[PDB]
Design a protein around this ligand. Structure first.
Ligand SMILES: [Mg+2]
Ligand SMILES: [Mg+2]
Lengths: 89, 89
């Protein structure tokens, strides 16, 4: 396993903790993504952060407006929060 | 550091090995991304894989057609290759 493969395995495992592992297509609901962000990005998000901030982030991620985000959307968010994307501006 | 933060740090470090660390905006050229994929995803890509396959992947990732991909585009690719995205179909 390369470092890249190990890192992806860890990111998938965190996604699995909050999503299902038994669903046909693994997705996070809005409340599940909020719990994930506050627990895993606790120095950028906290349970003190505005719930409106988290809600607006989810609405922009949930492009199809079904109330769920998939793994690809989730990791795009994490990568953008970490290496602060200029697309945010 | 959470598991998610550690995994992102590792993915950023791999990106840095092939991109610059001194450029204003860190990007990978086409040849740099190809080297990264063959070294870090060696059971999905190999130096035996068609160079045309890698070239078509880069052209679809390089959305602005400038010959470079950024970190967000790169990680979208890695996440799609790992958890095989149905968007590929
Ligand atoms: Mg959705
Ligand atoms: Mg480009």
């Amino acid at each position: 396993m390369s470092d890249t493969q190990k890192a992806m395995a860890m990111l998938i495992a965190t996604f699995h903790k909050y999503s299902g592992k038994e669903g046909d297509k693994l997705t996070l609901s809005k409340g599940e993504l909020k719990e994930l962000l506050t627990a895993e990005m606790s120095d950028v998000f906290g349970k003190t952060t505005d719930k409106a901030s988290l809600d607006n982030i989810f609405k922009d991620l949930d492009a199809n407006a079904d109330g769920s985000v998939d793994f690809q959307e989730y990791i795009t968010l994490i990568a953008c929060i970490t290496m602060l994307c200029n697309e945010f501006f």
